[PDB]
């Protein structure tokens, strides 16, 4: 008789703690860090800090939780279904490896595979085009040319909307925007309006890489709510 009452005492205590954990669970944002390889993930992680690996960082009193899967190294990814309900995916690609063995085409294929997945159908991607200075150096130098490895670069021309930084050569910005549009075309072709892509030009000396993620996540949540309320 008293056994039934004894169990309900433990149920009430357990249900009290589950309420505290729900507050924390819904007030934090989960981010997945993904990279092609030899791209600079460790350096990108190091600047924000200042099996599996998790890092904690808080900006403007908002808690973020980033995951870097490195224990599982394979060409097939069946663990990717676990990340159905993340806020965003951070994709890091080395922009200067357009000639060394092609690594850039492999990164494009990986991005296309990720975008068209059956489970990642409502997840946006934050794109970090790393190693900008190496690209600038090997483009200014005449040692190698892009059109030898990407034939479409010959007919490509810079758009009028492009705004290069001061002091930049036209060839460097043409190369940068061509590489960016190569990803943007894949992003736009199959998108149904439920997820976008936010490309950024980063470097080793950049220090504002922790504000870009904050702004992009804010935009993602705002757009999701707007689309939900039939206003976008």
């Amino acid at each position: 008789r008293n056994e039934e009452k004894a169990q309900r005492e433990a149920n009430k205590k357990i249900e009290k703690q589950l309420q505290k954990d729900k507050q924390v669970y819904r007030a934090t944002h989960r981010l997945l860090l993904l990279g092609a390889g030899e791209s600079g993930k460790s350096t990108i992680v190091k600047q924000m800090r200042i099996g599996i690996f998790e890092t904690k960082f808080q900006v403007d009193k908002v808690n973020f939780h980033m995951f870097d899967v490195g224990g599982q190294r394979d060409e097939r990814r069946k663990w990717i279904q676990c990340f159905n309900d993340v806020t965003a995916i951070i994709f890091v690609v080395a922009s200067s490896s357009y000639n060394m063995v092609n690594r850039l085409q492999e990164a494009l294929n990986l991005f296309k595979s990720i975008w068209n997945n059956r489970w990642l159908r409502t997840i946006s991607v934050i794109l970090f085009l790393n190693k900008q200075d190496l690209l600038a150096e090997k483009v200014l130098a005449g040692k190698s040319k892009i059109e030898d490895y990407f034939p479409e670069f010959a007919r490509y021309t810079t758009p009028e909307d492009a705004t290069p930084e001061p002091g930049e050569d036209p060839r460097v910005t043409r190369a940068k925007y061509f590489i960016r549009d190569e990803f943007l075309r894949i992003s736009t072709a199959s998108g149904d309006g439920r997820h976008y892509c936010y490309p950024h030009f980063t470097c080793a000396v950049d220090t504002e890489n922790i504000r870009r993620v904050f702004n992009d996540c804010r935009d993602i949540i705002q757009r999701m709510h707007l689309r939900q309320y039939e206003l976008l």
Binding site: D161, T188, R218, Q222, L226
Partner: protein
């Protein structure tokens, strides 16, 4: 003909409201913080359609109130209570949509089920304090010959108020929520424009009517349903004999019709359509 139209209005209101309420109750994927306000709004409209409209229709068609003065006072009180509690919930829905967009990071902490319940009971208490309290205590009665005579007559059921109540109740019921709704929806429109401008700048070449087609519908139906009556309410007390008694009732019934449109406006999401396909057919 008039009886047929009135019965059709009653049936439509009751059917829509009951369907929405039972669809929310039966399933578990439709039980969120937002849907609680919709449940409260659906309640008032059902109570309005179930109670107020049939007796007003009978009084209009028979041209004679066949109940005591107590029932007439009770009917007026429940009329004001249902009208007040229905408009003020739309303001709550608008404010929730405002907070969900302008401050997305803090939205989860800002609103919780307990806070939603507290807000709903606060709205209903404020609505009840302005309808039963001033009417049952006879603080709203007029003081001219026709009003006194028709109060004395047992067969009357007519509306006669002084200036103070006709101004205060109208302000509380209509004019305060209107400013809030206007400000909220203007800010939401600005946010939508900003996002649309960002998207076009980022990836425009590879490729605001959407927001207008929604906001205009939402604001226009409410304004066109409830504004003329709440203007003539002030007008006919400010100066006498300007407003005929046959237009007051017509505008009031035009306002009553709005109870049958809310389920269409606020329950068109795919989840509601799927739920309706299950319960029906």
């Amino acid at each position: 003909g008039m009886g047929i139209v009135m019965s059709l209005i009653v049936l439509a209101i009751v059917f829509g409201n009951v369907l929405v309420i039972t669809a929310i109750a039966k399933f578990e994927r439709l039980q969120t913080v937002t849907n609680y306000f919709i449940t409260s709004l659906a309640c008032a409209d059902l109570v309005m359609g179930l109670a107020v409209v049939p007796f007003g229709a009978a009084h209009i068609l028979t041209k004679t109130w066949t109940f005591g003065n107590f029932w007439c006072e009770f009917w007026t009180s429940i009329d004001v209570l249902c009208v007040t509690a229905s408009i003020e919930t739309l303001c709550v829905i608008a404010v929730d949509r405002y907070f969900a967009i302008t401050s997305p990071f803090k939205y989860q902490s800002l609103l919780t089920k307990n806070k939603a319940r507290v807000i709903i009971l606060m709205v209903w208490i404020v609505s009840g304090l302005t309808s039963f309290l001033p009417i049952q205590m006879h603080w709203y009665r007029a003081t001219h010959q026709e009003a006194i005579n028709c109060y004395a007559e047992e067969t009357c059921c007519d509306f006669f108020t002084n200036q103070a109540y006709a101004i205060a109740s109208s302000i509380v019921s209509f004019y305060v929520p209107l400013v809030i709704m206007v400000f909220v929806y203007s800010r939401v429109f600005q946010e939508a424009k900003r996002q649309l401008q960002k998207i076009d700048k980022s990836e425009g070449r590879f490729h605001e009517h959407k927001a207008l087609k929604t906001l205009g519908i939402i604001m226009g139906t409410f304004t066109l349903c409830w504004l003329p009556f709440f203007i003539v309410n002030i007008v006919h007390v400010i100066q006498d004999n300007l407003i005929r008694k046959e237009v007051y009732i017509l505008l009031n019934w035009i306002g009553y019709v709005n109870s049958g449109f809310n389920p269409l406006i606020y329950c068109r999401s795919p989840d509601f359509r799927i739920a309706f396909q299950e319960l029906l057919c």
